């Protein structure tokens, strides 16, 4: 569970449509959001995947 695993997502002001992963400390697991393309945070990744890969869930 690294730091920026706690990090909420970030949308950004941008004017797009993605749909990127995260570590949701309510749910505890990796949910995902619709992502604008504007600043990317830390706490955003490709695939629910890359997030377990990242922050390690289970």
Known sequence: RPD???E???TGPCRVRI???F????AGLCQTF???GC???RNNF???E???RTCGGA
Do not use: E
């Open 19 to 21: 749909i990127r992963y």
């Open 4 to 6: 920026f695993c706690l």
């Open 23 to 26: 570590y949701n400390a309510k």
């Open 50 to 52: 890359d997030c377990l």
């Open 39 to 41: 600043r990317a945070k």
């Open 46 to 48: 490709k695939s629910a």
């Open 34 to 36: 619709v992502y604008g």
């Open 8 to 10: 909420p997502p970030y």
